[PDB]
Subunit: 91 residues, 6 copies
């Protein structure tokens, strides 16, 4: 069980993914700075596309609470209705 | 396990979220007034968007039974059909 | 675990909700008449909107078998298709 | 646990419902003829609407294998697509 | 637990159904030729309609790997979208 | 439990499928080169159609991280909305 393998499922909510991410990070053989850099790269690098869109919309300099607050709607009725409406609109 | 971390899932019903909220609140090192203020801030602050819409519609001075009664339809067939209909209508 | 807290989930079928309702009612400190009045008030008062619509359509003087028979379709394919069709029709 | 209480869930497949029906019937205090009559009344009487439609379409003199074969499509993609198409068509 | 009772659920994937089919077949009191004939009759006879369509499309002289390969898409997004599109098209 | 039997479910995410694939591969009686060839044939050969489309789009010379990164969106809201939009568009 390594940190590079923690990938977000297509239907897994973002909070469970980040929970598994830090849980695996606490059990990884690496220094503190390396764990911080992994937090700044792999946590967003290994997300699902539906959340990588919103996380890419927040841009850099976004805190963890802002990311989780911005992605906790993915999956819910409003987000699915909006995504389907945009898909039918553009196609 | 802290109180600031209890966040509502995108598909979790509101009643389970408030149940976990008070369950974690009973096991938090804080005075009574602090627990009341946390109840008045974090419970609505850390909800999912689909319920934050209705809770924002009820406005302040709304009791817990009014919130739970107003949000227990989120997820059900009628709410999903209405949200999808509005999404197709505006887009 | 009190009787006032038994609320129907947005996706829970009506039969499971009434099962939990009577199960909790048998373990509540109240007289027989009080349990009957609770059966006549809270069981319909604390239902989800999708079932409160049909239970409101049956009106008073409706037996338990009539309620459960009228609400056991909520969630199924026909009910979801009809609700979505009405939502698209009115919007 | 009585036989009159075995009701089909809105999303439960017909085979699980009839399995619970006969399982409860084997543990009911009634004679053989009474169990046969219960099989001929309650098994179809206490089904969900989506299956009561097809079972009503088969009419009487239909065997158990014909009922289960006719209702094992309820829930699947084809049945949901057809029901939704008819709902959008009539509304 | 007999072999005639193993029926595919409306939402069960074909691989789980055939797994239960052979698992029950190994524990059935019948000769080898009888088990082969049961494999050639009941495995396709007792499938759900959504898979009986594709298995009927493959025709006879189709191997097990061809059946499972042809039916492993039932349920997935592409198959549901195609079935719904055809349902809306014909209705 | 053989390696030829590990097939991806219609709703199983790709990461769970490849996890079971390597887990079963580590417990298979075969040399290293044979396990590598099995990795280069069966892992893509025995996928579901929704992922075989994207894996066929990546073409050969694609690494495992590229495959998993390209298929982790299958199932999510965006992929389902896009597939449904294309299905309604072509039909
Ligand atoms: O009433 P159901 O037949 O069980 O329909 C559900 C429902 O889909 P729809 O509301 O779009 O019909 C779920 O949607 P949610 O609101 O839970 O999001 C969806 O789950 P996904 O969100 O993952 O799409 C799930 O689909 P799946 O089979 O892929 O789990 C699908 O169930 P059926 O596909 O069995 O209809």
């Amino acid at each position: 069980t390594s940190i590079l393998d923690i990938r977000q499922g297509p239907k897994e909510p973002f909070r469970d993914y980040v929970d598994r991410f830090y849980k695996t990070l606490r059990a990884e053989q690496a220094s503190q700075e390396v764990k911080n850099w992994m937090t700044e790269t792999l946590l967003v690098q290994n997300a699902n596309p539906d959340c990588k869109t919103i996380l890419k919309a927040l841009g850099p300099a976004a805190t963890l609470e802002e990311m989780m607050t911005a992605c906790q709607g993915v999956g819910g009725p409003g987000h699915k209705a909006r995504v389907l409406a945009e898909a039918m609109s553009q196609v």
